[PDB]
Design a protein around this ligand. Structure first.
Ligand SMILES: Cc1cc2nc3c(=O)[nH]c(=O)nc-3n(C[C@H](O)[C@H](O)[C@H](O)COP(=O)(O)OP(=O)(O)OC[C@H]3O[C@@H](n4cnc5c(N)ncnc54)[C@H](O)[C@@H]3O)c2cc1C
Ligand SMILES: Cc1cc2nc3c(=O)[nH]c(=O)nc-3n(C[C@H](O)[C@H](O)[C@H](O)COP(=O)(O)OP(=O)(O)OC[C@H]3O[C@@H](n4cnc5c(N)ncnc54)[C@H](O)[C@@H]3O)c2cc1C
Ligand SMILES: COC1=C(OC)C(=O)C(CC=C(C)C)=C(C)C1=O
Ligand SMILES: COC1=C(OC)C(=O)C(CC=C(C)C)=C(C)C1=O
Lengths: 404, 407
């Protein structure tokens, strides 16, 4: 079998590109290889675990988001042979392509922590990063009575770097408005030395932490979970060899993450396993008919759906000129955004580019907690996601930004 | 299924050392080494091979000649590991089970991640001291050098012997002066890193030499493409994502990107990043109590060197004995490592440190200074002790000699 355009991955980047590609080469010349039955708008999972949104609202059947006419090949990619323009699937089938677009996302690795994912079968522990553990966050919050509440951040790349602390501010506000704050010691144990990588939003988060009696312990990485005993083990990344066992009344886990297994050894990967693409055009550095988008690439900016949206716009142009034997000229800037939920009524909308410097859209100031930015995150963006991005029409708010 | 009490994956520096030590503990018949290569190499001397000072063929011996006598040698490649079922697969289509497992699969070279490589090595003026196929091409390119750029790279990955990408730079610079062509060479070190070295005492000494010898170091520069035909090289700027620089060379020494061995990258015994996940004090595995790891393939947060393998092998010996007696380990690895920075054909800055990244020097004098003594020890004493003492299980680092210097 053969397709002018073969898309690996039916998540955010995959559907968006197949939508856009259908209009360029025809729906009958595009195929998507995606194994899962459901497609998830993962960003709302932060609010699900805080008890603010229902989980079933976050997903729809994968057949709903397939652009009509585009082939859904429900399989797992198990091998890439770009030298001979094909891939293999766990159906023992070989698929050739004229062009290839890789959008396989990022892989969660709960089992590299001793005791996970088995311990998740016990109470008081949860994780907003997986459809099987996001509601367990919310139950741990309701079931909280007295003690330590621990929020973690791993020593790997992650998607939505702001999410692990978003649920901490949500959990804090929950304990206050429910009469349990006095009984909570609230701890952010993070592998990093900084609360956030862009200083003007870091400063604003530092302010909140200082006023709400939250503790941040830097260079602490979760390595072991003893669910039965309600204990967690951290290693001190500043003192190799040193560890600390902490008891918890509630534990929220951000798991270690890595590029998908089939990409780790693939020829399309760099040394570290991410898809090796041009940092501006998103074309593969060694295979001119391969392209990458989203979490699975080595694009040196934060891994978010916003970035996918802005990346799709650029890639649409790059593949088009390539198909026409022209040199690309439109360049990606590293745009990305984190809507930092600081409470049930407020969001700090951080936006920046490759320069790790702010690049805000709205003329007011997004360093300050805002109801409008909360309502945008909670209500508008899911709507634009299902009805505009996955239909290949949203490509970054730079065209909206330059209006004002 | 075939079975052995102690199974060693990899017959390089750490694997041969642990097998000799284990033979004396459980008997040679209960030890097996899985290693596919016919030849065992003392890679440290390759630095002096690329500089024209030592013969490549003396850096190697047949693997059969270093296999501790009586130990089984399984000439094959490990293709999968299954710690849950105490077994591994080989490219023979054979499984092998174990009571204890020592992982020593080193680190892996990824020349093909640079566009143009390794095809470009067919051309002159380009070499790499990190591969037996390319270490002599460094020397030849250095002999062929007439005029222009001599470029030396450092990748955006973990490496082994972090010092070697610049040892060859100093050796080449000396050679240029030795042969009267220093005037005609512009000498560039393009590093992905932000600093010349990670311990300040020795960084300062290296900076003094960069200044006195007029070397240019461009930080956050990563080699991404070689065009051997046109003798150009393409570097990416890690501070400004997206921009690149094309620059011609008259000599290019490539330090390749490096990574865990493919077989480990997806394995249950690796951490999320692919390195063997071990306890940083005892070298015991964090999740499987009967797996241990040594050397370049581990997540031990210190320099990847054979000196480290030596110091870890003494710890691991004590760790495994205590484990076989069902006790708790108490001897702790401190992260000892050492990098003999060859700064010229007769001087060496013997850098030694530990997990704190602070100096832990063995000799009573100051190893921050270039020394002839330390060069001779690197070039002549160390290979002899390697072939005759480390590979026989009788070298585990020099901390006894350091404590001995206590009056
Ligand atoms: C809790 C949480 C909150 C977040 N909040 C925000 C937010 O507020 N703002 C924001 O901008 N972003 C947010 N994100 C990030 C956003 O969800 C992702 O960055 C986005 O989904 C990236 O899409 P992707 O296409 O790169 O990968 P995904 O959308 O994850 O999809 C990748 C697809 O690849 C498929 N796949 C995997 N392996 C294979 C294989 N071998 N063969 C075939 N298919 C395969 C998967 O099934 C999946 O469908 C959040 C993420 C989480 C988890
Ligand atoms: C140019 C250079 C200069 C150096 N200089 C110094 C120095 O001055 N001082 C110092 O202390 N160190 C130095 N080193 C470092 C030293 O070479 C290594 O750190 C040391 O060899 C580590 O040993 P190891 O067992 O981990 O791996 P290695 O000795 O590299 O060997 C690992 C073995 O695993 C085998 N293997 C790989 N994959 C598989 C598989 N799938 N199945 C089975 N077997 C497999 C390989 O064939 C190899 O034999 C230098 C290295 C280089 C490249
Ligand atoms: C980029 O390479 C160089 C440096 O980087 C390490 C220097 O520090 C220096 C020293 C700086 C001063 C002011 C002497 C020189 C001369 C140089 O060429
Ligand atoms: C020369 O023989 C050796 C010993 O006997 C004195 C050791 O105790 C030890 C281990 C103890 C220290 C403090 C290095 C090693 C490694 C060794 O090689």
């Amino acid at each position: 079998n053969h397709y002018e355009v073969l898309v690996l991955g039916g998540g955010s980047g995959g559907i968006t590109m197949a939508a856009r590609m259908k209009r360029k080469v025809g729906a009958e010349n595009v195929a998507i290889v995606e194994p899962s039955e459901r497609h998830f708008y993962q960003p709302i999972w932060t609010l699900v675990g805080a008890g603010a949104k229902q989980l079933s609202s976050s997903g729809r059947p994968t057949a709903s988001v397939i652009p009509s006419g585009v082939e859904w090949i429900k399989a797992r990619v198990t091998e890439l042979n770009p030298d001979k323009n094909c891939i293999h699937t766990d159906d023992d089938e070989k698929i050739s392509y004229r062009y290839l677009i890789i959008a396989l996302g990022i892989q969660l690795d709960y089992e590299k922590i001793k005791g996970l994912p088995e311990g998740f079968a016990h109470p008081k522990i949860g994780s907003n990063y997986s459809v099987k553990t996001v509601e367990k966050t919310w139950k741990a919050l309701q079931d909280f009575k007295e003690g330590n509440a621990i929020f973690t951040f791993p020593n790997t790349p992650v998607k939505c770097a702001g999410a692990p602390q978003k649920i901490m501010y949500l959990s804090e506000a929950y304990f206050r408005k429910t009469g349990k704050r006095s009984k909570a010691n609230i701890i952010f144990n993070t592998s990093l030395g900084a609360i956030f990588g862009v200083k003007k939003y870091a400063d604003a988060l530092q302010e909140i932490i200082q006023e709400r009696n939250l503790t941040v312990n830097y260079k602490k990485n979760l390595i072991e979970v003893r669910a039965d005993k309600q204990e967690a083990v951290f290693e001190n990344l500043d003192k190799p060899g040193e560890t600390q066992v902490i008891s918890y009344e509630m534990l929220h886990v951000t798991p270690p993450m890595s590029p998908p297994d089939v990409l780790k050894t693939s020829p399309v990967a760099d040394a570290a396993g991410w898809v090796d693409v041009d940092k501006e055009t998103l074309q593969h550095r060694r295979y001119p008919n391969v392209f990458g988008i989203g979490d699975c690439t080595n694009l040196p900016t934060s891994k978010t759906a916003a970035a996918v949206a802005a990346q799709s716009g650029i890639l649409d142009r790059t593949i088009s000129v390539i198909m026409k034997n022209q040199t690309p000229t439109k360049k990606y800037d590293g745009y990305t955004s984190c809507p930092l939920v600081t409470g049930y009524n407020r969001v700090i909308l951080a936006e920046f580019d490759y320069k790790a410097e702010p690049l805000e859209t709205f003329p007011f100031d997004q360093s300050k907690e805002r109801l409008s930015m909360y309502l945008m995150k909670a209500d508008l963006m899911p709507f634009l996601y299902w009805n505009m991005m996955l239909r290949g029409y949203w490509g970054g708010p730079a065209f909206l930004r330059k209006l004002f």
